[PDB]
Ligand binder design. Structure first.
Ligand SMILES: Nc1nc2c(Cl)cccc2s1
Ligand SMILES: Nc1nc2c(Cl)cccc2s1
Lengths: 263, 265
């Protein structure tokens, strides 16, 4: 793993592991989501840093608000996948982190991802109003000209997601996170929400289709002692609408869309 | 990753990842269990397997774990390189044993060790049987002939009998279901998920004030993707020892049993 020549992006190679692949001997979308997360932590570490150095005097952390992933080819077990990552300021809204996934043998793009991050107080949760000016210490680690993984005007990564209406077509109820679903700070890692969203997708769709696009909006965090319900409705390639909510009160924690192609 | 000079063992280095560590910034026992599993698959691949042979596939026979014993001294920190050496050995007609040695890549010292007992089984009927003569001769060429034990001790805890947890249990984690990330390429529940399920009944205070030293786990029945599981725990004992029992919620069928040993940080 290493920063590129200009220092405005980071690169890392990953050999696909045996337990990381699904029933078709290619890495799962959760494995890919974990690799995007790993290369982001090593990029933060290489430039001197979910927690991040500075802004900790105000008890300020970066939280994900949206994660959009689009895969063309899932890497096979044993293959090397190279991931390039970078960040970019979006004015007073927050930060955007993009990823490009390539095959290490061909050098061809096999996937791409984008995320929207926002500044939040780690104690009062919610958000301490994301709008900072003297936080210009991140502009030195970002490319100045726009560099977008999803550049096209009117693309899937910026479309509004509606709220799943009751009743849902499919549902996976009573989901609880175990100690392997928590990070070093004991919060549920964002990849577990992706796994929970896919639990409501019927087995037949997973066996006859491959996941092409997955857009996920983060609204609330699920605690280690909370129980979750996963809801799904076919909206259409097969398209779906998703809703994660707390099994009791029905408090919304997540919402999203998935797009699937026939194998 | 590569086989050693003699071809009777395999070695592989692993950099510890951010999501692989727990609250102490060191790899979890489930992460370690996954690395032991990964190095075993790469050792099977390096000697021409996929770990069945043309003889085992002809009879619809597969290898299944019966016991997994892991003992950790130091858990590798996030960013550190851990080298794992693995090898197999015939145990007559009972089956095979696979041992592991974990070392620090900077110091070269043993930081952990593991052992497992594997048995021959028809993948369709689930019936166990003693290893046949013509099958055993196909593995002897990939195993050291003289004994090579990770746990050589005269009375090591890796061969001790595990009793059945009596009701009522002291602690319990009820209603555990495996998701699609808990399944392997053949859609069976990954052996490592049972370790995570066993540790779910351990109270949070014990995890926060202690570190896991030893974990012995016996596999009796496999859990299907649609089964619900109950995890039971009772303190049997500085060091805290526990007795564990994984059983199906629907009718209480025993699937797993084991013991864990913990020391104060
Ligand atoms: N908010 C930002 N975080 C980062 C990191 Cl972690 C690495 C490089 C650039 C930036 S801009
Ligand atoms: N049963 C056995 N399987 C193996 C494998 Cl997979 C590698 C090396 C030695 C042996 S003996």
């Amino acid at each position: 793993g290493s920063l590129t020549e200009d220092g405005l992006s980071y690169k890392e190679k990953f050999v696909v592991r045996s337990y990381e692949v699904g029933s078709n001997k290619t890495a799962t979308v959760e494995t890919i989501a974990n690799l995007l997360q790993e290369v982001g932590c090593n990029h933060a570490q290489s430039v001197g840093f979910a927690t991040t150095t500075t802004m900790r005097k105000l008890h300020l952390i970066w939280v994900t608000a949206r994660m959009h992933i689009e895969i063309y080819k899932y890497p096979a077990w044993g293959d090397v996948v190279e991931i390039e990552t970078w960040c970019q300021s979006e004015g007073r809204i927050g930060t955007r982190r993009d990823w490009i996934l390539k095959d290490s043998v061909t050098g061809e793009v096999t996937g791409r991802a984008t995320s929207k991050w926002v500044m939040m107080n780690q104690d009062t949760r919610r958000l301490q109003k994301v709008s900072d000016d003297v936080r210009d210490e991140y502009l030195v680690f970002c490319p100045q000209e726009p560099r977008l993984a999803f550049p096209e005007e009117n693309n899937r990564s910026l479309k509004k997601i509606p709220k799943l209406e009751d009743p849902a077509q499919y549902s996976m109820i009573g989901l609880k996170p175990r100690r392997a679903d928590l990070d070093m700070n004991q919060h549920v890692n964002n990849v577990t929400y992706i796994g929970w969203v896919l639990e409501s997708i019927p087995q037949e769709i997973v066996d006859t289709h491959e996941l092409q696009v997955i857009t996920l909006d983060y609204r609330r965090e699920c605690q280690q002692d909370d129980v979750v319900d996963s809801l799904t409705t076919t909206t259409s390639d097969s398209q779906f609408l998703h809703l994660l909510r707390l099994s009791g009160d029905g408090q919304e924690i997540n919402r999203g869309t998935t797009l699937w192609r026939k194998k």
